[PDB]
Amino acid sequence: PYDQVDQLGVNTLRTLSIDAIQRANSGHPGLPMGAAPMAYVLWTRHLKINPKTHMNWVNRDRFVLSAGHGSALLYSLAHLAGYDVSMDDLKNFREWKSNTPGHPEYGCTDGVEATTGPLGQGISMAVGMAMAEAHLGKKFNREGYPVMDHYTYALIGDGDLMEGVASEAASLAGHLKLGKLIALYDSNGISLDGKTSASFTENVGARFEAYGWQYILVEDGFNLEEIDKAIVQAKAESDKPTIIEIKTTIGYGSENQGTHKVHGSPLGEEGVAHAKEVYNWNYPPFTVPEEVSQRFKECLQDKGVKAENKWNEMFEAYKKEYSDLAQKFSDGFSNKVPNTLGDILPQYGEDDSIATRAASQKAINALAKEVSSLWGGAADLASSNKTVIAGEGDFQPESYEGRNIWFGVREFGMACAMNGIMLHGGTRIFGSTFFVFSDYLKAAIRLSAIQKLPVIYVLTHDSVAVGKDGPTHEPIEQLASLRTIPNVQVFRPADGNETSAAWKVALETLDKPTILVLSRQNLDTLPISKEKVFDGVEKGGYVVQGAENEADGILIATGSEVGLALKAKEELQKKGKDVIVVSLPSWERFEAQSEEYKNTVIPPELKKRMTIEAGTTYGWAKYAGDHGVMIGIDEFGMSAPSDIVLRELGMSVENIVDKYLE
Amino acid sequence: PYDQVDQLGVNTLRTLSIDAIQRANSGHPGLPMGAAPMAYVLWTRHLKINPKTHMNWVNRDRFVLSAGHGSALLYSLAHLAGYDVSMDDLKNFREWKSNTPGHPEYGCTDGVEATTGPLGQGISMAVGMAMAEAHLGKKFNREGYPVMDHYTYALIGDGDLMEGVASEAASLAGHLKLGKLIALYDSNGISLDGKTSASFTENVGARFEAYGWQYILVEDGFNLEEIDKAIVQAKAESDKPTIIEIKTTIGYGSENQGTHKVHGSPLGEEGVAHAKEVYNWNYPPFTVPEEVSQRFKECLQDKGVKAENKWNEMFEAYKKEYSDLAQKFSDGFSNKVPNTLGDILPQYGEDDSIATRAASQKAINALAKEVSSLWGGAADLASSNKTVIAGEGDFQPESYEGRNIWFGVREFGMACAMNGIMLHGGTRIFGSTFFVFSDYLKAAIRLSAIQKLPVIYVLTHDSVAVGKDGPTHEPIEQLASLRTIPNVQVFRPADGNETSAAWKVALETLDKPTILVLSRQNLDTLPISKEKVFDGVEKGGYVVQGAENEADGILIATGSEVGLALKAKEELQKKGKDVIVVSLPSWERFEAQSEEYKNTVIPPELKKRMTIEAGTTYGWAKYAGDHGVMIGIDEFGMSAPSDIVLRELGMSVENIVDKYLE
């Protein structure tokens, strides 16, 4: 099974990682040193990948380093395995423009499946990848045609297991019985500040068992043979996901091994030498020994090529027997969308009154028949958010084809799962909760943005118009929270047509997440054509009603406040004041337009402006100008009837009119 | 033990709650109906409180309804118990300005210990309350003087237990062996969307046991006697916190009992009648029966008065035997602070170079001797944040007097615990993590703000200057995230004197949380006096260097960018341009100043302005104006040496100078 060359492999990982860190004079040597043994066994015997085709083989096993600080080990693996990470790349760890950055960045480095610096999120994404494999397998697989059949692995440490979000992900994964998911827990009794037993002395195996996982202990984590065995039993147990606790010694080889001092700093030239002693390692820095290159070739590369070719062959047969199906399987992965979205989506007449959450629910159902790769759910708020895909089944172990995911009351875990689902490929995902609770998943939105994933977030109950549930349930600052996240687009639709148009844009946008911000209360339909609303929303902002002749002023608004501005336009047309009304459903989309376009919507030279949005005024001075007035809410709300809360916080016609006139 | 009158009590809670909800035509009747039995047993036999003194008795048992949607039960209890919640108040549930709002609001209603609409946070705050009781008891208690000796209870449901943050809190509570903490779990198999088994089928008892809690099952949750017994065993087990799982039927009495339909909506007049049938209840709406009033008086009120008086008597003896101690015990609760803070805190000379995280560490240690009620810790980042209180001990079961809390990698649980610590009273708490991970605890900051708690958040590693760790670890949008939260103050100190001044302000501010945003890299000391910096920081913004005569322009900056602006002032004084330099360490504090003061710092009439901050430009147009230029970063950062990242994202002198001149 395992012989002496293999140990020289383990130690090649150790040394590369440590040399990389030492040359950068920056990085985290402890995990590489304690976890090379486990990573070696996995990558050489148990990872079904083919580096020769980079990350394009859709049925490769997926590996995630959730303990993202172990990056130097991941790169050393990617290099040994044959990905486009060269020795020179390892020598540029943490250097400007390198493909070997401080924490792993998906899209930056060949072989890196996920961006994982932030703790907890790596494993919770892996859970999403595993849900996707299960979903797709059940939808597409057939007698003799295992088209979506693979494992999901996550390497995790104590930090991951302390984070709430990894609890939410593990509970959800246990309930969904994701038997193809396996976690390798590098259990070394050390976190950054010191002994883990200063804060974390819980029984991890038992918790995991309480979730419906399988727990396996490997007491000797430098025993390659035992790790292999544990992974084999993890695989045989396909009714349950499995966590393998692997007892290791952090910083193995340093005088400081087993202490916090090896967690987050280079060893220094002395400590690198001392570890090389203990390893009986005599090679110069940044050398791979020949027998190690050859063992990886043997174990990993050649096996990978043959499994991909046997999958390509099996696949060509699939596509001939089950033609229409395999075409959908391909369209899933390539994100094909129909040209008729504009016709498929619901349209609203000038008399319609509908809440944007309900108009979103109607888009979802109209879309589900035509975009067959679309699935999603709510964080135990499908009935409140309105995010049931009617008659399309529930995603459960006995029905992995069901398209309605029941995330439970797990906002952050939901978001991270959606990231994994999208890293996996093959579907379009959406997830809903209340906008005020976007604070709970904000760090995952951040990761959607970094990783450029077109996750769709459906955030309902968007303002103090929520009413009786009171301040904790009434958003104020959450638009500012999400608009500021780079590489996102936030749409706050003003009626049902804007809401349909926002969903179309969300389907057509493939390199950033789209966030839809939706009302609880009914809103009137804007008095202009479908054609113009769709154009305007595709552009992020547009004129809803111009001035007959020369404009006295301009009202710029979003969401539910656009109807308010339309009313204030009427009241003001009396008093002798003819104002423009602009809807600005997305700041980000609006600013990506030409200066020419933007000038047509907000006249650079017109200076009597009012901005109106039920949320903080922070940021609005940009459109309001030195001379403008900002109507907004910069205080917590209250528990009262909707109309009273709005009136009292100044989201009224009378207030907008008075403020424009004073 | 329990007799027929008691059951009529249980049913008074049920009916009041349901009438309250029905009249409001808004609210959540399911939990009240299924959990009155448990709440009755607790409040009448096991809650050591005295309503006659409201919430002023510092050693009362603390009760938290974590399932905040059960508010109508909480108010019915507060009313029956004798708090200032009248029958008329119950008739104004969810009505404007009522003291009976939709979800419970601390500070709004007599008898309400915590604001708990957002799920997970109620129990995690309770954990903090329990840590405070343990801390204070160990510090102050003596032979025959149990001055801080009481229980902490939390009533929780399935939603709480799905949330990550309640896992972080339960793990931490298990590790700290908080034996005075008891949770009552209303386990009814139902969440909002449907059966809990659609998403949540884990073994809660076993997880809780894996944390180091005691688990007790009460299979018949309408058996008053069994609940009582379980609470008695929970109390006898003082080595471990205890969760009591109480199997109930949600909406008991409705045709719809045991379904999701009773979770979040009124029953309707029909269903209220049908529940009253099942209860054999013949009274008119909003009636308390006489024997019930008398049983509460008997069980709860009179016992409460005698326990408080016996504590007052025991206390007067304490204060005479242990005088200096009991004076500190009182100063703790009243938030007394010395007048010499300004002298105690570290001061920096014009040559000093220090990172604001390190200057904060020095303030912490200088403060700890003089403010004896100050304790705190880090989310497994004490060594990175710099939040070790030197030589003041660790907070652990064998040393509950230790003042350094090891929260582990539990940002959100840390924050919520700090809220509970502050609701409890008796200390000043601070907690640290990396600023980029404030996203993880943002919902708890929100609750500090709502509840007006002067929690201190120490957020380090504030910008892309972090460098090699790369984008996931480099804040961009997080200042916008926190500045927009109503009722907070965010300070981004520009040197060590501003950092000392910010800590003083944080101690003196008692009605909102203070957030300190701190640098990783060293910053130079600002070239002006201690006196002027302290004045300026107390004011939120101020002039650092004026123009010799007439100003050509103004540079307004924060944090580390103030030193940059000072350099650009030198380079610009050449080219014939004399500019003002303003430091704006806190927007919120600055805007609370008079218009007169603000005009002296930022001249209303001067229009050549540049704002400079290493983070998003969103919001800055307010100070920059129509004609100004905003220097900021609106993209994710990169993994590279600190100085290169700053240069490339334009946080340089050369860029500020060119931009001011073009």
Author numbering:
A (entry chain A), B (entry chain A): 1 to 662
Question: What text comes from the article?
Answer:
The generic transketolase (EC 2.2.1.1; Tkt) is a ubiquitous enzyme that catalyses the cleavage of a carbon–carbon bond adjacent to a carbonyl group of a ketose sugar and transfers a two-carbon moiety to an aldose sugar. A cofactor, thiamine pyrophosphate (TPP), and a divalent metal ion, Mg2+ by preference, are required for catalysis. More specifically, megaplasmid-encoded transaldolase (LSL_1888, mipB) and transketolase (LSL_1946, tktA) complete the pentose phosphate pathway of L. salivarius UCC118. In this work, we present high-resolution crystal structures of the L. salivarius UCC118 Tkt protein (LsTktA) in the presence and absence of the cofactor TPP and Mg2+ ions, which have been determined as part of a directed structural genomics approach to furthering our understanding of how these bacterial strains colonize and persist in the human gut and enhance the wellbeing of the host.
LsTktA crystallizes in the trigonal space group P3221 with a protomer in the asymmetric unit. Overall, apo-monomer dimerization buries an interface area of 3998 Å2 of each subunit with the formation of 16 salt bridges, 60 hydrogen bonds and numerous hydrophobic interactions predominantly involving residues from the first two domains of each monomer (residues 1–528). Two peaks corresponding to molar masses (MWs) of 138.8 (±0.8) and 70.4 (±2.4) kDa were observed for the apo protein, corresponding closely to the theoretical dimeric and monomeric MWs calculated from the amino-acid sequence of the histidine-tagged Tkt, which consists of 680 amino acids. The peak distribution indicated approximately 75% dimeric and 25% monomeric species in solution. Other changes involve small shifts in the loop 190–198, which is clearly resolved in both structures. This differs from the structure of S. cerevisiae Tkt, where two flexible loops (region 185–198 and 383–393) could not be modelled owing to an absence of electron density in the apo structure. In comparison to the apo structure, 48 of the 54 superpositions had a global r.m.s.d. of less than 2 Å, with the largest r.m.s.d.s (∼7 Å) observed for the human Tkt structures. The two structures are globally very similar, with some slight side-chain rearrangements triggered by cofactor binding.
